[PDB]
Structure 1
Amino acid sequence: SYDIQAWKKQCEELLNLIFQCEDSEPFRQPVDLLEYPDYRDIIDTPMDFATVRETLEAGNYESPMELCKDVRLIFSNSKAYTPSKRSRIYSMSLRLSAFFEEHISSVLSDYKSALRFHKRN
């Protein structure tokens, strides 16, 4: 498909699947700072899936690359905050990341192909 706009609904459908995953529950809303009082001593830029969905729905992503950078920050934040590579929440993040990467690969490829077709002449 050479549709330059198709990534947006493809990303909405993938966020729907991520919200149905039990593994997403820790990442649906901002990290609770009363629960984890040192969180902002370790994490400079908090990110969560509700924030990513709102950003997309506001029309404040220009490309699926930008959405992909914010989703990858959800996962790098969990790796940076975990006290162990065996923690429950970190382990959930690694399964959810594998799922996300499996699904976003075609979204990115199709978008970049569409942009190349737009500039072909």
Structure 2
Amino acid sequence: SYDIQAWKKQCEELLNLIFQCEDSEPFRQPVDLLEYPDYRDIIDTPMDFATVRETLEAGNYESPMELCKDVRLIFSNSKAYTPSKRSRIYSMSLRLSAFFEEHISSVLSDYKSALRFHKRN
């Protein structure tokens, strides 16, 4: 499996699966500061799955590792903002994180293998 570009379509399909998940609902758009007045006191770099998709679709990721960094920021921002480890929105983040890591591991492995094969000589 030595296609250096295959990660992009794989990431588009995994973002489609995440957008079908009810658990992604809170993570698909920005936080309204009228609903959460303190959100930006706590979170200095916001991130959501619409921004991740639009970055991928614009050709502004060079590797799946960069996409993976931004998706992990979505989840770390949820862990930082939550006032309880058993909040509804934080608990949704943890299930979605487990699904994302399960699916992204082959994408990263295949990309890194493909690049190694490219630089074999």
Structure-1-length-normalised TM-score: 0.99
1:31-89 Cα offsets, whole Å, 9 max, x none, are 11111011110001000000000000000000000000000000000000000001000
Paired with 2:37 and 2:20, the residues of 1 have a C-alpha distance of: 29
Q: Give distance in 2, aligned partners of 1:113 and 1:104.
A: 14
Aligned to 1:23: 23
Q: Number of residue pairs matched?
A: 121
SS of the counterpart of 1:4? coil
Post-superposition shift, 1:30? 1.1
33-42 vs 9-18, greater mean Cα deviation: 33-42
Superposed CA RMSD in Å reads: 0.4
1:104 is displaced (CA, Å) by 0.0
In structure 2, C-alpha distance between the alignment counterparts of 1:31 and 1:116, rounded to whole Å: 40
For structure 2, which runs of at least 5 residues remain unmatched after alignment? none
The structural deviation recorded for 1:26 is: 0.3
* Structure 1 unmatched ranges of 5 or more: none
- Runs of 4+ aligned structure 1 residues displaced above 3 Å come to none
Aligned: 1:35 with 2:29: no
- 1:112 and 1:31 mapped to 2: Cα distance? 34
Instruction: Provide the C-alpha distance between the structure 1 equivalents of 2:32 and 2:13, rounded to a whole number of angstroms.
Output: 27
1:90-114 CA deviation, whole Å, 9 max, x = no partner? 0000000000000000000000000
